Amino acid sequence: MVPISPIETVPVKLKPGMDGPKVKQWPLTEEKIKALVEICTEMEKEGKISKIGPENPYNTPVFAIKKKDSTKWRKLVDFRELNKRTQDFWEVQLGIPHPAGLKKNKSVTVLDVGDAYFSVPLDEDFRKYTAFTIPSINNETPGIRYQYNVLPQGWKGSPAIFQSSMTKILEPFAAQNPDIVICQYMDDLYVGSDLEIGQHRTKIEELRQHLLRWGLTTPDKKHQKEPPFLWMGYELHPDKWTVQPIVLPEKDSWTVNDIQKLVGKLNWASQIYPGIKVRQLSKLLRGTKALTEVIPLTEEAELELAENREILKEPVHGVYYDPSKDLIAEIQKQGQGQWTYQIYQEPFKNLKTGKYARMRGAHTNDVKQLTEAVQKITTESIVIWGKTPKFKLPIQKETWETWWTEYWQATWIPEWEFVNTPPLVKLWYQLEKEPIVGAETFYVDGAANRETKLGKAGYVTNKGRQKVVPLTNTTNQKTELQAIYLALQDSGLEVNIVTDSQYALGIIQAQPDKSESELVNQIIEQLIKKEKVYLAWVPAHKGIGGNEQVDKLV
Amino acid sequence: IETVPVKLKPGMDGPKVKQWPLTEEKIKALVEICTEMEKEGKISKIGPENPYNTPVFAIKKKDSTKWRKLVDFRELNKRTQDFWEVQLGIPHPAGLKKKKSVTVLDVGDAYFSVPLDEDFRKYTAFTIPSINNETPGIRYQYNVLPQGWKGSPAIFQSSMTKILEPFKKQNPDIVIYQYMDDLYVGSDLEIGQHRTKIEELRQHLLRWGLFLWMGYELHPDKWTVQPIVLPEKDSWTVNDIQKLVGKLNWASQIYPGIKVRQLSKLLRGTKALTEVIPLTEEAELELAENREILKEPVHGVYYDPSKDLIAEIQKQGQGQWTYQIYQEPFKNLKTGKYARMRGAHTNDVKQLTEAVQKITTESIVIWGKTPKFKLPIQKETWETWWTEYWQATWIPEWEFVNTPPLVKLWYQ
Ligand SMILES: Cc1cc(/C=C/C#N)cc(C)c1Nc1ccnc(Nc2ccc(C#N)cc2)n1
User: DSSP alpha helices (H): ranges in A12-93?
Assistant: First the structure.
């Protein structure tokens, strides 16, 4: 006998207070029992399980399921209850590697490790909680009682403990072989390197020798699997990757589900298929808990979907990462709060692509969205490559400087360069810092009757110009904006406007270039037409000049 | 050698905070540091049965090129049982703020000589992530008091007090205060021997067991305080007067005797904003009466240890920043103004991050705790960049202000 190192077990406990499961074993059929008896006898012989006394009071229901009328039966131990009662684990299985982060490996060997899973002992003091019973033929004898000695498939802590046990064993091998990579995916170990297929096979032979130390044998494997690999929805090729084929459904009748299911695909594809849009197609689905609703596609969605299929026409691949070359990220404004980007090291060879959608809000600005997209790409790039990419942005250096030095909030974009590809992001208007000499001064105001919803908006100026417009179905807030709007409509190219509205100032000082409120949009449209605008605020009801609340109090 | 038992607050579990993305350089630094800390028994690898987690990252302190590991124990701290030691809670040294000068020493290393309560260790778990998560993250837990944990100074307090008696007795006028991994040493002795008293204190510390080489000097005796002031002009335009009335109306929420009637009267009529208006007698007297009022201190302003400190910061442009610390609205306990050429002339966020640290430091010296910040920045921008410019061993709390404060100019 060749001594083999044992796999350290992981101390498992049940959640605080809770106790093991105690679930009723259901009546089975004579043939299923005989089926289970056979299976379990064989599992016992292998060490996976062990018959237990009548002491253990815990129980988990077992079942028999036929593998689609084949010459076989399968045992199904339902650990759902036990799982609800098992402590939480460190699911070190989160946030998978993104294909664009991988490096090239001309040689990728696959080794099978199905039999290693059971080579993993179950914490001794925890086994009893895994007890199950094979009912007896006709219920005339006590059912056969068993308990696990190994991680049970379907048990909450199996995925985590297996990965951690496998990693711990591979650890010393990976550390001393820095020129190879190993990845656990299902019952397999994928070992890649970029060594000459000769020095690569040696290294595989060494891994097998190393694994033997723990008694783990891998059927001699040049697996039934060779490039391209289907993994996590992607297709990994020797020197390139892509998402698994995206097939846009053809229909005349699209329902809530069909549409959102169309979203997911477009979203998944957007990581490599450039310029994908999902604003309109996603637009239609806010209010759907019901999924069979045959909803119509606005002419916008049809155009977006047509632009989609087109991009999906040709298959697109992304390259792998080369740590020796720079990382570059390019962004484009797509309209309607939509942005698209590509990250690459060499022109025309993207590592991956992506998109960004403006956050929901009533007022917004292109520069703020460009900035948010930059932050998002920065974080994703830190995740994938451990570094910030150099940005190429459609905004002039001068526009950015004017923006951040005057913005009331602190803001920042990392190293970047202007890329002149329309439509360029710009500032649409810039308020004055000082009152304008020679420009007419408009004192505006508005008010509304909370009950009747009747109101008025208007202005009086230093030249005697005046206006008061009566309004219906309005509020104070809207009348204050309307007043500002009237002043802008009725003034020349340069104008000073005095308001007591903290609300309107709150909006205008946020510098929006677009809004959901058509009233804010009309004001923005007027701002863009002016050459100079000074907006001044004064406290309401302080006997301050021209602040004619009276004209509007009526 | 003996460990003081520790537990969380009744009904709360340990932290389960996500590790945020780290750059390759920070990851490499952490692997090197943690490898060495592991050889030294300070931390130990942990298995999947430990579900807890606290974020970790790396920084470079005041003028050194050596990476320091910083664990973000903010969550664990608010879940760690209020540690009332044999100290009864050391009544914050109200005299530290009055001292001519103060040097801040990093004595966190000392903590690593005291073992941690075995049953509590699991709660200090942290992960060193891998780029693109290609390999599973390295999981560890502490075996000794971790730097940055609330219970570390508390538990090591008894050890610290006796390690300084020779000094405290040798130097009775020097005020020494401890906050987290920092020791604040204040005295009126000029740098010459204030430096040497520290250098003496360093040796004294280096001998009594325990990068200590660093020092950070502050001058709380000459700190930035802020009274409200009004313009002094020979000719006031309508706009100047509208701005004055706005500012006085604002101050009237802080000071009760403020009047604007006589000044707003001057604003009776729809006049051109740039037209010069001569001040009436009544208006000029009201302005004088307001100036006098603004020179007295704010009324009924007191600090309360049971309440949080709140710090508001405004970007004034051109590298200048203003801030106010209070507990009750309009009852400022401290206000200030900043502007320096410290590695951030084109970086808004680096400046704000530096301002946040100076304000916190100031707050520690004065009250013995950190304030809750209201930052003039979008959450996503701040959370993406602040760790690149952080140089302190503690980390305060913060929230974001998304609506422009109308009161910006009135503070500058
Ligand atoms: C994530 C991953 C999945 C599989 C495979 C899982 C499955 N199924 C195989 C390996 C070896 C890895 N790990 C790494 C690590 C670094 N670079 C790479 N590059 C790389 C990977 C696959 C191909 C191919 N073909 C080419 C290059 N892979």
Answer: 30-46, 80-84
Nearest CA to ligand 1 atom 18: A102
Q: Is B353:A343 a contact under the CB 8 Å cutoff?
A: no
Backbone angles phi, psi at B41, to 5 degrees: 70, 5
Domain hosting residue B15, numbered range: 5-94+120-160
Identify the helix (H) or strand (E) that includes residue B265.
helix B261-265
Structural domain harbouring A105: 93-117+159-227
Residues 410-429, chain A: which have Cβ within 8 Å of B?
410-412
Q: Which of A380, A409, A444 to mutate to test the interface with B (most CBs of B within 10 A)?
A: A409
Experimental method: X-ray
Q: Which of residues 489-508 of A touch B (CB under 8 A)?
A: 496, 498, 502, 505-506
User: Among B102, B110, B109, which residue's Cα sits nearest to residue B162?
Assistant: B110
Please give, rounded to a whole number of angstroms, the shortest distance from the CA of B356 to a CA of chain A.
13
Domain match, A131 and A16 both: yes
Residue A343 phi, psi (nearest 5): -120, 125
- The CATH number that applies at residue A472 is 3.30.420.10
Task: Classify A378 as helix, strand or coil.
Answer: helix
Pick the last residue of a domain from B217, B244, B259.
Answer: B217
Q: Considering only CB atoms, which chain A residues are within 8 Å of B19?
A: none
Considering only CB atoms, B245 lies closest to which of A379, A506, A539, namely: A539
> CB count, 10 Å around CB of B69?
21
Same domain, A315 and A328: no
Resolution of this structure in Å: 2.1
| Closest listed residue to residue B90, CA positions, set B403, B391, B367 | B367
